[PDB]
Amino acid sequence: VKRGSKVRILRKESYWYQDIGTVATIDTSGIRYPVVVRFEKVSYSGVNTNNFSLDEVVEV
Amino acid sequence: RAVPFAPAPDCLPENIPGYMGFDPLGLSTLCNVEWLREAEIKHCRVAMLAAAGSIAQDLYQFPGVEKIVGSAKMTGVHDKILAAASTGDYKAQAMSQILFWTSFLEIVTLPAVFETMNGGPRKPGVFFFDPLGLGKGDKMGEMELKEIKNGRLAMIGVGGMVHHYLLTGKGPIQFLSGIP
Amino acid sequence: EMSEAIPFMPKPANIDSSMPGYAGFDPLGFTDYYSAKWMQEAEIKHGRVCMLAALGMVFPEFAKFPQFASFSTNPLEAFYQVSPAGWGQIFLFIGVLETFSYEKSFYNFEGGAPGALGFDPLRMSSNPASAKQYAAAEVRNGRLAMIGFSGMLHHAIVSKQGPITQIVEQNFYPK
Amino acid sequence: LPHLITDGRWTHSGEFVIPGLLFLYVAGWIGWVGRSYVLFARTADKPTEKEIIIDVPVALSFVSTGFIWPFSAFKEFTSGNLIVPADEITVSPR
Amino acid sequence: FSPVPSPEGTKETYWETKAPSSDVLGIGAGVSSGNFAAASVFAALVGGYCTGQVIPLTVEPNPLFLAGSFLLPYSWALHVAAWIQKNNGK
Numbered sequence: 029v030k031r032g033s034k035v036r037i038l039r040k041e042s043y044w045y046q047d048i049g050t051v052a053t054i055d056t057s058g059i060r061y062p063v064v065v066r067f068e069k070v071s072y073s074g075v076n077t078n079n080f081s082l083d084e085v086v087e088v
Numbered sequence: 089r090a091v092p093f094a095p096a097p098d099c100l101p102e103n104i105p106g107y108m109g110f111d112p113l114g115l116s117t118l119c120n121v122e123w124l125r126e127a128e129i130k131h132c133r134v135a136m137l138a139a140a141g142s143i144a145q146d147l148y149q150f151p152g153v154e155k156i157v158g159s160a161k162m163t164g165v166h167d168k169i170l171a172a173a174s175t176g177d178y179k180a181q182a183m184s185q186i187l188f189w190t191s192f193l194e195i196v197t198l199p200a201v202f203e204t205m206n207g208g209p210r211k212p213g214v215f216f217f218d219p220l221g222l223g224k225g226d227k228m229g230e231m232e233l234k235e236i237k238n239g240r241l242a243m244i245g246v247g248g249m250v251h252h253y254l255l256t257g258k259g260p261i262q263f264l265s266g267i268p
Numbered sequence: 269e270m271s272e273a274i275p276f277m278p279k280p281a282n283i284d285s286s287m288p289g290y291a292g293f294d295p296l297g298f299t300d301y302y303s304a305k306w307m308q309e310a311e312i313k314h315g316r317v318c319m320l321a322a323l324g325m326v327f328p329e330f331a332k333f334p335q336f337a338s339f340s341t342n343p344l345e346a347f348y349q350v351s352p353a354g355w356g357q358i359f360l361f362i363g364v365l366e367t368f369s370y371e372k373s374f375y376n377f378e379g380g381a382p383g384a385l386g387f388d389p390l391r392m393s394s395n396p397a398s399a400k401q402y403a404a405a406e407v408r409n410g411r412l413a414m415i416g417f418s419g420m421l422h423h424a425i426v427s428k429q430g431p432i433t434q435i436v437e438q439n440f441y442p443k
Numbered sequence: 444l445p446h447l448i449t450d451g452r453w454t455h456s457g458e459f460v461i462p463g464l465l466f467l468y469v470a471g472w473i474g475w476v477g478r479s480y481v482l483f484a485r486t487a488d489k490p491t492e493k494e495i496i497i498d499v500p501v502a503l504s505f506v507s508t509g510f511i512w513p514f515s516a517f518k519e520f521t522s523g524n525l526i527v528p529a530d531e532i533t534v535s536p537r
Numbered sequence: 538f539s540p541v542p543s544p545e546g547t548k549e550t551y552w553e554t555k556a557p558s559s560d561v562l563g564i565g566a567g568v569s570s571g572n573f574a575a576a577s578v579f580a581a582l583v584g585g586y587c588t589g590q591v592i593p594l595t596v597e598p599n600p601l602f603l604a605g606s607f608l609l610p611y612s613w614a615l616h617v618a619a620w621i622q623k624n625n626g627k
């Protein structure tokens with residue numbers, strides 16, 4: 029993906045699983061979860077952002 | 089083509105025996121041709137027995153049937169025989185025996201129709217019943233289409249013989265003899 | 269593109285001019301959510317059933333069958349008169365015919381033209397140009413028959429007589 | 444005491460069938476109008492402020508539209524805008 | 538969690554085709570589709586006749602008509618087997 033694109037989450041235990049976020053940044057290091065995704069809904073913890081991978085994020 | 093006005097259906101094979109191409113309503117398309125042929129041949133044989141039975145019944149009667157049957161009857165005979173069978177007479181159980189034996193033959197010839205429909209080696213209508221061997225032996229004659237022509241005549245002929253005696257009390261020989 | 273039937277409304281995408289009775293009349297988009305072919309097959313099937321039924325109301329009036337001469341001319345009365353056993357025979361005949369349609373849908377739905385069960389004994393419509401007229405006529409007469417049967421049925425309820433008989437007595441108004 | 448017959452017979456439709464038709468017309472109106480406002484409020488600058496401070500002119504524009512809710516809602520359904528597909532709905536992992 | 542036993546002669550019957558494999562017919566796996574179809578009609582007619590003959594049930598019913606009445610439900614299973622065999626080319 030690329031920064032600013034809209035993505036559908038595929039991590040089955042995510043609060044936003046099968047919901048749409050927008051990509052904030054993508055790390056280039058050896059990070060396990062390099063895609064930072066922000067959402068408009070808050071989770072049950074009141075967090076509205078999370079880190080993911082590339083197999084659990086699909087552009088829409 | 090019997091009628092040039094109405095064409096013969098393509099599904100009907102020209103090669104198959106007894107084909108005059110008379111299918112004006114094209115009923116061959118609706119049903120399987122092999123099954124239709126078998127139904128025709130079976131209908132012709134049953135009809136042929138029925139029509140001769142009508143003529144023979146008037147001319148000759150087996151001994152003692154005269155008491156159990158009215159003197160002149162056709163379908164009335166069937167009803168009369170059944171009436172005595174339902175009554176409980178031992179002697180008039182002819183209908184059950186005819187029904188039983190024809191049914192048994194039909195039951196044991198049942199796989200033949202399905203087997204031919206699956207492309208089996210036997211053709212429709214040939215049960216290989218030629219003990220004498222004279223009629224169908226070797227090359228044979230026009231008897232193969234003779235059966236079909238006589239059978240078709242028998243079908244309509246039975247229809248005529250049965251329909252007469254429904255409106256009249258006259259039997260086949262009697263109605264032919266005197267016409268009013 | 270706009271619909272021919274309703275000028276101000278647009279043309280529904282799923283229906284097309286090739287379809288036999290096309291007029292562009294789909295104000296609610298049934299075809300949008302449901303396969304065009306299935307709806308076409310349903311329309312023709314309903315039309316055939318109604319076509320037969322609509323003739324069925326008028327025909328006994330002119331001449332009933334000899335066995336059923338006693339049976340009432342009024343269609344609704346006739347329904348109850350028929351034996352349960354007789355309806356069972358009719359249901360079996362319809363079921364035997366419907367086995368062919370059962371195979372055509374589900375097993376071989378994608379291929380063929382809608383409403384085609386292979387019933388062309390007279391071999392009419394072999395030529396494509398002739399076929400186009402025959403198909404269009406079938407769909408249109410089935411549509412008229414559907415409206416006509418619904419009319420005949422509700423009007424038989426109000427006045428208990430066959431349609432020909434109702435014309436004779438002119439009891440056309442609620443009263 | 445009067446008893447109500449509710450099996451569907453037409454000689455008694457004024458006890459359940461017709462009050463029921465009136466109810467379903469009003470209830471479907473309320474549902475259609477509320478749904479139209481939640482979809483409007485999603486496209487707002489602050490969608491959650493539109494639900495505790497209601498935009499009264501727009502909400503009145505919506506309450507007037509409900510009189511033809513059966514046709515609007517069925518056309519909404521067949522045009523693929525009433526029902527969302529199963530893969531845009533968050534579900535439990537199971 | 539441990540191997541689940543099945544009787545000897547257990548075979549795989551899961552199917553995703555048009556018709557199930559003929560093995561689902563058990564001892565009738567080799568019977569033709571025509572033979573099931575004719576048995577289907579025969580059992581339906583004989584079963585319906587025998588059932589009809591004893592619809593007003595008495596304290597003395599004919600046992601052959603009772604036993605013959607069980608041919609009606611058996612005919613349903615017969616025409617299902619006829620469809621399975623016709624769609625397996627038998």
Ligand code: CLA
Pocket residue numbers: 134136137138140141142144145148149150153157165166169182193217
């Ligand atoms: C569909 C055919 C049919 C039916 C339902 C009947 C039914 C009846 N007939 Mg009639 N009948 C028939 C054909 C038929 N017949 C034929 C073909 C003839 C000979 C030309 C007769 C001659 C006849 C006489 C003379 C009498 C009857 C009588 C009767 C009644 C008593 C049964 C009896 O004695 O029959 C007897 C019938 C026969 C002996 C004919 C059997 C002919 C067989 C079938 C020829 C078989 C040839 C071939 C070798 C078979 C091939 C087998 C293959 C299929 C495997 C009964 C209502 C009696 C009655 O009460 O009448 C008033 C009576 O007296 N029938």
Ligand code: CLA
Pocket residue numbers: 133134136137139140141143144213214215216217218222223224231232233234235238239
């Ligand atoms: C006009 C009658 C007629 C004719 C010409 C045929 C002809 C044929 N049949 Mg068919 N068939 C008929 C009637 C007829 N059948 C009837 C009524 C039955 C039922 C009993 C059958 C049952 C039958 C079977 C089961 C089979 C045939 C087969 C055959 C073929 C080969 C055997 C042969 O040469 O038979 C020649 C037959 C005749 C010449 C019939 C002669 C009958 C006599 C001469 C006249 C009728 C007498 C009658 C009893 C009444 C007398 C008069 C009465 C009014 C007083 C041949 C094409 C076989 C076949 O196709 O495969 C090889 C076969 O498997 N047929």
Ligand code: CLA
Pocket residue numbers: 113317320321323324325327328331332333334336337339340341343346347350389
């Ligand atoms: C949906 C259609 C439908 C239904 C439910 C009924 C139902 C009824 N009809 Mg009516 N009828 C119909 C159509 C229908 N009919 C049509 C189209 C005709 C004109 C032929 C008639 C003519 C008619 C008469 C004359 C009589 C009835 C009667 C009756 C009652 C008893 C059953 C009976 O005899 O039906 C008969 C129904 C038919 C014969 C229609 C069968 C049409 C089949 C299903 C399709 C055939 C298509 C086509 C011909 C295929 C040809 C193939 C080609 C190769 C040749 C029953 C209430 C009887 C009654 O009690 O009167 C009140 C009565 O006497 N009907």
Ligand code: CLA
Pocket residue numbers: 473474475476477478480497502503505506
């Ligand atoms: C107009 C908005 C709206 C709509 C279209 C729906 C639609 C639905 N609800 Mg929901 N619901 C809503 C508001 C709404 N609800 C609110 C505010 C609450 C909190 C009380 C609930 C609580 C609720 C529960 C607990 C359940 C549903 C269920 C359902 C479904 C079946 C219908 C039903 O049971 O109604 C039931 C409706 C209620 C119990 C409460 C409704 C209260 C009012 C009347 C509706 C709100 C009006 C709103 C203020 C509109 C203002 C518009 C204006 C600003 C223009 C359907 C998906 C059921 C379901 O999932 O079944 C599949 C179910 O179990 N809903």
Ligand code: KC2
Pocket residue numbers: 244245246247248249251252255256267268
């Ligand atoms: C529907 C089926 C049916 C068939 C398949 C059929 C076939 C044949 C054949 C074919 C083999 C011949 C050769 C033949 C000959 C005659 N038929 Mg015919 N016929 C059928 C039906 C009726 C009816 C309903 C009547 C009738 C008549 C006559 C008379 C007139 C004699 C007379 O005027 O008395 C003669 C000569 C009338 C009659 O019986 O008068 C009492 C009359 O009622 N038929 N018929």
Ligand SMILES: CC1=C(C#C/C(C)=C/C=C/C(C)=C/C=C/C=C(C)/C=C/C=C(\C)C#CC2=C(C)C[C@@H](O)CC2(C)C)C(C)(C)C[C@H](O)C1
Pocket residue numbers: 135136137138139140141217218219220221223238241242244245246247248249250252253258259260261263264
């Ligand atoms: C197969 C074969 C074998 C066999 C065999 C058999 C049993 C062969 C039998 C063949 C038969 C029985 C043929 C009979 C045909 C009857 C006809 C055409 C009647 C038409 C009536 C009409 C037109 C009429 C009429 C009218 C009159 C008179 C009366 C009025 O009231 C009515 C009406 C006006 C309509 C054998 C055993 C040889 C072995 C061989 O190896 C294979």
Ligand SMILES: CC1=C(C#C/C(C)=C/C=C/C(C)=C/C=C/C=C(C)/C=C/C=C(\C)C#CC2=C(C)C[C@@H](O)CC2(C)C)C(C)(C)C[C@H](O)C1
Pocket residue numbers: 319320322323387388389390391392409412413415416417418419420423431432434440
């Ligand atoms: C398929 C096939 C072929 C075929 C075939 C066949 C048999 C086709 C059959 C076609 C049929 C039966 C068509 C019948 C249409 C009836 C209509 C349109 C009635 C409308 C009634 C109205 C408008 C009304 C009304 C009423 C109103 C509402 C108020 C009332 O108070 C009075 C009133 C009565 C006036 C064949 C066999 C040739 C072979 C070929 O190879 C293929």
Ligand SMILES: CC1=C(C#C/C(C)=C/C=C/C(C)=C/C=C/C=C(C)/C=C/C=C(C)/C=C/C2=C(C)CCCC2(C)C)C(C)(C)C[C@H](O)C1
Pocket residue numbers: 163166167243244246247248250
């Ligand atoms: C014992 C029993 C019963 C029974 C019974 C029976 C035996 C009933 C049999 C009934 C039959 C055979 C009826 C058929 C009648 C019409 C026919 C044959 C027309 C043929 C010609 C046509 C269509 C045209 C042909 C043609 C011609 C003109 C030339 C051109 C070409 C073509 C168009 C082909 C009962 C009912 C009595 C009751 C009783 O309790 C028990």
